[PDB]
Design a protein around this nucleic acid. Sequence first.
DNA 1: GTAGAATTGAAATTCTACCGGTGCCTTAC
Length: 511
Amino acid sequence: AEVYSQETLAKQVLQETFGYQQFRPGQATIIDAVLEGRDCLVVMPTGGGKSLCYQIPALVKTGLTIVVSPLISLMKDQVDQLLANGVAAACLNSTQSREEQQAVLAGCRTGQVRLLYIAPERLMMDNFIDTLGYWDLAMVAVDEAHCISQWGHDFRPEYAALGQLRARFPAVPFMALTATADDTTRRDIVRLLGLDDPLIEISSFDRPNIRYMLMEKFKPLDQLMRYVQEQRGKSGIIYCNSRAKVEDTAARLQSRGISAAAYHAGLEHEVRASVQEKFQRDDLQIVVATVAFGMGINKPNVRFVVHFDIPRNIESYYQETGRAGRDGLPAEAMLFYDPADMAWLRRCLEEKAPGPLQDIERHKLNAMGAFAEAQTCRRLVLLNYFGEGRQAPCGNCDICLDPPRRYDGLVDAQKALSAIARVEQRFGMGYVVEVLRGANNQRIRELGHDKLKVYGIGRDQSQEHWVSVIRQLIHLGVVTQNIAQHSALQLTEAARPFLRGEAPLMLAVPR
DNA sequence: GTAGAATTGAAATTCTACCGGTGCCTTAC
Ligand SMILES: [Zn+2]
């Protein structure tokens, strides 16, 4: 009785303001829970109107809905769309004049405004919280709610402070929405936001039109160039883990004539805006970017997402690869993997404060590395990482399309390990390989490694082959590459039996 | 002192840099 009357009102809003006909599966349930006064956590990795989960009940309820958003540009996109549908929406941010802000605040006070978009830093100021007490507050919705967990612990602490708001207003329902959240992030959102036994609704993470590919990184730039050229004019994004790398890569692509521009947070806001706008207008083919190029990109025809450096966790990977193929047509995610890049990230993590937070981050990084090293379907790894049970392989990932192939690697291991032995475990990868292929430069003849027996024993095979062999022995735990001594290749206890070679060994051909 | 890109006349030689990254808010004691 009381719950269907609510849903009836919601349906009319769905029709009258948004112009849709029927609720899809799951929508009515979330919307009803919110109308019934319950807290909600909505995880909709799919698409494409999860904003409706709060906008519709904000238009049925009497009072103001506050929507917390991480980005001025998001605030503006959503307020503008609501204004186009005739809804009294507004926002507050620092690019407004004071008199503009005052008029928004008076609108909230009078009930003219129905939805107010606002950043947590403004919202969580003590005095602002006090002014809210006097408004008629119907709901609080936190968009891109993964930011609570991903930013609230360090980069933007007011994201973690929103629970204080929750306790100040126990009678107003709170809703958190996100597209990417593993179990850890979900629990972190519930905790930090103080959600009270929330309805949790999680839809599928499957993107069947995205093909997940990985390529072992040997000649980064040449492989990237060859890959970009094979896209033959297609629109795409190339992610790197540093501003510098983004500038270089951008430049070096422009050199070869490719429509590419750099995008990162050290560029001026009018440049970033132009790059994004161009990319959207299809006036730019490729954006080369840090994580700054991200939220609030509604470009439906991104055909490839390249990770030139492996991301810091699977959620970032999922979210970034997921910008491809939003129109439903074949798109490709392509990861260029160097294990050394993992070691770099591991190093960055275990420099900061020990404890539970770092163990979570280390776990999530480690999971990213396991996805990269998997010899099973990539999609099975992703989907199961997110708690979506599946066992059948996808047929549309690099492991499924080109299965791993193993060979007797015993002899190769001997050569590589023996070569590392002879140089007394004081030299890096590049050097040890030079030795292996019998290629003579000054340092070989100078140090006298051209007379050694192992010198040139692997000249019959490429430097790519030996990098893969050695990368594999590091992964197996036979060889270390401790940054401690400038990434010198050292042998471990497990080296011995292979070096004498009665312990058998399969290796994999490189990807 | 490694590593990858670029430079040299394909393997050797310099030549670079050796590694984070995300955004709100700025209303003076
Ligand atoms: Zn697969």
